[PDB]
């Protein structure tokens, strides 16, 4: 172990949790950014599995009778493992074909169906050139996955082809149904020829959103929806049942909440008779989880049915973990298998989490268990209630923008989850303080830093509302670390919807404290300009009186042809508080330098004609030399190399630059033999990044990453030698998701570390050896 994770567990949208039918307590989890995790203790702890070509996983299936053979459906196609998920290989027939369901023929594990699909991730189906519209197809293997046949069930190239489920008749293994936006289809020869099943009301709601079939094969359950381009605005899915011997649908929503996106129904494999247990959650909607009971008679008539919430709002009966997400959005839900020694239970989620319910057949009760985070003995106070801090169970799937550390305190600023805070060095966390009174949540935190309020170390943060990275505005908050404990509180200083302190509403893509005067804080409001808090102690003095001290505007950026309009990273000068650098990503791009004059006025100018949306600049001092380091595209004549991002270095504050790292350097230090995905999607890979470069003392770090495909090439550490040259080494090591949004060199407990945040796998740190620092 080299890279050390510091996360509270999970935190990203979970696609599925799949049980191994051959052995109780063995489960796999499909993440949308880090691939597949495995557990052999029913989710008490999770371990990463082998490397996939694409990490956006929609389906995992374990071969009945062979736990070593596992199939994984990803956005780029099907993978097969023959060593129990230790290693994976892309299946050539399905390359560039997103797969989201995998089903085995009952009694013949060599007969497999893998169906094109992508769950609700319509936003991502085009990342590799696919479209939602196309012929309706499935892939069928009859030799256990060595070869696959392409079967067409609909030939309309202009209609949505997403398949949501494939389900076999347990009582007649050659009968199989599929549920698709194309409709529900049936095959009586194992999936080689299909016929369409008419829906309950195809003129109005033709799209199927999942089917279920009773084990005796006699009853089909389905939900149906109107045709609309985006699930965001398609809210009412209705639930129906029909006998399969004569298609005649009846609506069976009596007892369900109205106007919900019910999907992926599923019959308990234990329902072998005329009473069927049907598990029903939904995409997006938060209502917990339903179990329905349908009592048919032997005439094929439904005597009665009833839906029961077996999971509901937070009420004290289950540990919600750190992710206070109530009611649960049960975006997947499965009964446990009847094989392998499994007990009867339910696997589900609150959306970003993993939950397992055990079942009491005496009183038909469910007991929900947190399978993503572990509470510690530390407590935080919020809503007048005490909540534990939580340490991860082995997974981490958060989009983390930035990180700051002071003594025992760590904060990572995340998308979706906002202010993620730790008071034990990053072992356990809580983000409860981001849920503010008045009904708004500080769910997007793009920058954090540590300032100085009259000698008291004070966290500063760009913290605003908005999910999925859709930050609403620039908004500056501060937390005085009086106790380095959960008792410390956040207060708002500037920005927000109310334009507090005269700070405009443009997002502060970075907030930076001056190392020379840590009371002074710089921030760049997107499309407005660069602003400054001269002394944060004075700003808090006004705040404590119920007043507000205005911020100072030091640069105006409102002209696209002449001004820098957006900044990604601000680098104050390490020793001169009247000089700052920033990387401009809007208007006139590149590294900009500003200098304050005696009358307090500033002059700004471009010092490197670079570009790139996530371009960074860093300035530090080491043994008498001030280094200026740019990670970006371009640079001008003699430096630009197409759209390749490069590391450029200057020792004279940006008047002269030297190219010290390129993609060719990266490939020589870390050959493409190290990348499982090079042969298949290397022709698409672009040498860019999400950020994550840093410099301190004699060390420099960077990471090549292409967010278009969630592909990370590697992490590279450079050592500045006594003569000026930089020698580079590969420090990727065991970091499996290596793209980086930010990196900082941080000394903790007398040892120098590299703290790095990732756009999908949270926070990691790594020991750095042989480092020299200036005494500071």
Q: Indicate the annotated binding residues for Zn(2+).
A: 13, 121, 402, 510, 541, 556, 559, 563
Q: How far is the CB of 359 from a second copy (least distance, A)?
A: 43
Answer for the pair 745, 771: CB distance below 8 angstroms, yes or no. Answer: yes
Residue 29 to residue 36: CA distance in whole angstroms: 6
Site string for Cl ion, 693-732 (x = CB under 5 A): --------------x-------------------------
* Bond before 327 cis per omega within 30 degrees: yes
Q: Is 718 helix (H, G, I), strand (E, B) or coil?
A: strand
x/- mask, Cl ion, residues 245-264, rule CB under 5 A, reads ------x-xx----------
Residue 145 in contact with residue 94, Cβ under 8 Å? no
Candidates 110, 408, 644, 680: give the one binding a second copy (CB under 8 A).
408
Range 380-419, binding Zn ion (CB under 5 A): 402
Sorted by sequence, the CB contacts under 8 Å of residue 497 that are 6+ apart come out as 472, 473, 505
The only residue of 438, 455, 546, 638 in contact with a second copy, by rule CB under 8 A: 455
Given 308, 386, 407, 559, the residue binding Zn ion (CB under 5 A): 559
Q: For residues 495 and 508, give the distance between their C-alpha atoms in angstroms, rounded to a whole number.
A: 9
The minimum distance between CB 201 and Cl ion, in angstroms, equals 14
> In terms of CB distance, is 306 or 454 closer to a second copy?
454
* Candidates 7-15, 552-560, 701-709, 749-757; binding stretch for a second copy (CB under 8 A): 749-757
> Which of residues 308, 708, 733, 774 is near a second copy by CB under 8 A?
774
Question: In the bound complex, what is the minimum distance in angstroms from residue 726's beta carbon to Zn ion?
Answer: 23
508-513/521-525 β-pairing: antiparallel
Q: Quick one: which of 703, 749, 769 has its CA closest to 730?
A: 703
What are the residues whose beta carbons fall under 8 Å from the beta carbon of 513, sequence distance 6 or more?
A: 449, 450, 451, 452, 460, 520, 521, 522, 572
The partner in contact with residue 749, picked from a second copy, Cl ion, Zn ion, none with C-beta cut-offs of 5 to 8 angstroms by kind, is: a second copy
- Is 750 an interacting residue with respect to a second copy (CB under 8 A)? yes
User: From the centroid of its chain, how far is CA 77?
Assistant: 20
Residue 541 binds to Zn ion (criterion: CB under 5 A): yes
Which partner in a second copy, Zn ion, Cl ion, none is near 772 (CB below 5 to 8 A by kind)?
none
254 binds, among a second copy, Zn ion, Cl ion, none (CB under 5 to 8 A by kind): Cl ion
Determine if 605 is a binding residue for a second copy (CB under 8 A). Answer: no
By the 10 Å C-beta count (0-12 exposed, 13-18 middle, 19+ buried), 245 is classed as exposed
Among residues 371, 382, 251, the alpha carbon closest in space to that of 320 is found at 371
Sole window of 453-461, 486-494, 511-519, 751-759 interacting with Cl ion (rule: CB under 5 A) = 751-759
Which of the listed partners (Cl ion, Zn ion, a second copy, none) does 534 bind, with a CB threshold of 5 to 8 Å by partner kind? none
Non-local CB neighbours of 120 within 8 Å, separated by 6+ positions: 231, 283, 284, 331
Closest to a second copy by CB, 408 or 575: 408
Q: Interface with a second copy includes 771 (CB under 8 A)? A: no
Of these partners, Zn ion, a second copy, Cl ion, none, which one is at the site of residue 775 (CB under 5 to 8 Å by kind)? a second copy
Largest CA distance in the chain: 94
Task: Tell me the DSSP string of 587-653.
Answer: ES-EEEEEEE-TTS-EEEEEEEEEEEEEEEEEEEEETTEEEEEEEEEEESTTT--TT-EEEEEESST
* DSSP symbol at 393: S
Residue 759 touches which of Zn ion, Cl ion, a second copy, none (CB < 5 to 8 A by kind)? Cl ion
Contact positions vs Cl ion (CB under 5 A): 251, 253-254, 707, 759
Contact positions vs a second copy (CB under 8 A): 408, 455, 484, 749-751, 773-776
Contact positions vs Zn ion (CB under 5 A): 121, 402, 447, 510, 541, 556, 559, 562-563
């Amino acid at each position: 172990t080299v890279w050390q994770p510091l996360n509270p567990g999970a935190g990203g949208q979970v696609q599925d949790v799949v049980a191994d039918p051959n052995q109780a307590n063995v489960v796999y989890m499909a993440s949308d950014m880090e691939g597949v995790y495995k557990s052999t203790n029913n989710g008490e702890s999770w371990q990463i599995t082998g490397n996939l070509v694409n990490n956006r996983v929609f389906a995992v299936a374990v071969t009945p009778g062979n736990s070593n053979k596992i199939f994984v459906g990803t956005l780029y196609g099907l993978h097969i493992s023959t060593n129990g998920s230790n290693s994976y290989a892309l299946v050539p027939e399905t390359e560039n074909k997103s797969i989201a369901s995998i089903a085995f023929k009952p009694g013949n594990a060599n007969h497999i169906i893998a169906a094109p699909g992508w769950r609700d991730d319509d936003d991502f189906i085009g990342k590799f050139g696919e479209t939602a519209a196309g012929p309706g197809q499935v892939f069928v293997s009859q030799n256990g996955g060595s070869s696959w046949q392409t079967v067409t069930f609909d030939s309309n190239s202009s209609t949505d082809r997403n398949v949501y489920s494939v389900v076999f008749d347990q009582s007649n293994a050659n009968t199989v149904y599929l549920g698709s936006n194309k409709g529900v289809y049936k095959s009586t020869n194992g999936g080689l020829n299909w016929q369409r099943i008419a829906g309950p009301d195809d003129a109005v709601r033709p799209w199927n959103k999942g089917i279920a079939l009773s084990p005796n094969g006699q009853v089909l359950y389905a939900t149906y929806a109107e045709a609309k381009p985006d699930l965001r605005y398609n809210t009412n899915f209705l639930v129906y049942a029909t006998r399969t011997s004569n298609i005649n649908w009846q609506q069976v929503t009596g007892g369900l909440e109205g106007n919900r996106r019910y999907w992926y129904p599923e019959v308990d494999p234990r329902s072998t008779g005329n009473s069927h247990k049907v598990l029903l959650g939904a995409v997006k909607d938060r209502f917990g989880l339903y179990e329905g009971t349908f009592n048919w008679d032997n005439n094929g008539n439904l005597t009665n049915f009833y839906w029961e919430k077996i999971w509901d709002s937070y009420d004290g009966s289950w540990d919600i973990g750190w992710d206070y997400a109530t009611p649960p959005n049960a975006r997947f839900a499965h009964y446990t298998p009847v094989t392998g020694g499994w007990a009867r239970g339910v696997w589900s989620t609150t959306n970003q989490t993993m939950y397992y319910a055990s079942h009491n057949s005496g009183n038909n009760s469910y007991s929900w268990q947190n399978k993503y985070s572990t509470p510690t003995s530390q407590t935080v106070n919020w809503y007048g209630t005490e909540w534990p801090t939580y340490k991860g169970k082995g997974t981490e799937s958060t989009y983390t923008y930035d990180v700051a550390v002071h003594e025992n305190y760590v904060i990572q600023g995340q998308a979706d989850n906002g202010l993620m805070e730790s008071w034990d060095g990053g072992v356990s966390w809580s983000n409860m303080q981001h849920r503010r009174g008045g009904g708004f949540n500080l769910s997007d935190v793009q920058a954090v830093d540590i300032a100085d309020a009259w000698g008291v170390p004070t966290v500063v943060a760009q913290a605003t509302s908005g999910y999925g990275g859709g930050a609403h505005n620039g908004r500056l908050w501060a937390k005085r670390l009086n106790t380095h404990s959960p008792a410390d509180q956040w207060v708002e200083l500037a920005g927000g919807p109310n334009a507090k302190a005269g700070l405009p509403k443009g997002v502060l893509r970075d907030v930076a404290v001056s190392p020379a005067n840590p009371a002074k804080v710089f921030m760049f409001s997107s499309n407005y300009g660069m602003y400054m808090v001269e002394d944060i102690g004075r700003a808090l003095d006004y705040h404590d009186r119920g007043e507000t001290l205005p911020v100072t505007q030091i640069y105006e950026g409102l002209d696209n042809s002449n001004d820098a309009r957006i900044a990604r990273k601000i680098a104050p000068h390490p020793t001169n508080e009247k000089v700052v650098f920033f990387s401009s990503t809007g208007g006139v791009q590149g590294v900009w330098r500003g200098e304050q004059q005696n009358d307090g006025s500033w002059t700004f100018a471009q010092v490197l004609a670079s570009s790139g949306w996530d371009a960074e600049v860093e300035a530090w001092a080491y043994n008498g030399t001030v280094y200026l380091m740019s990670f970006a595209k371009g640079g001008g004549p003699g430096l630009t190399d197409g759209n390749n991002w490069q590391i450029l270095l200057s020792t004279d504050e940006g008047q002269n630059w030297q190219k010290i790292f390129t993609p060719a350097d990266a490939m020589a230090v870390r050959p493409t033999s190290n990348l499982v995905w090079w042969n298949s999607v290397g022709n698409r890979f672009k040498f860019t990044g999400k950020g994550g470069s840093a410099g301190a003392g004699n060390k420099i770090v960077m990471s090549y990453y292409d967010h278009d495909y969630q592909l990370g090439y590697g992490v590279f550490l450079g050592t500045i030698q006594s003569n000026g040259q930089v020698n580079w080494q590969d420090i990727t090591d065991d970091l499996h998701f290596s793209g980086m949004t930010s990196s900082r060199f941080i000394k903790d407990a007398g040892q120098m570390y590299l703290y790095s945040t990732t756009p999908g796998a949270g926070l990691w740190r790594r020991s750095i050896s042989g480092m020299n620092m200036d005494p500071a």
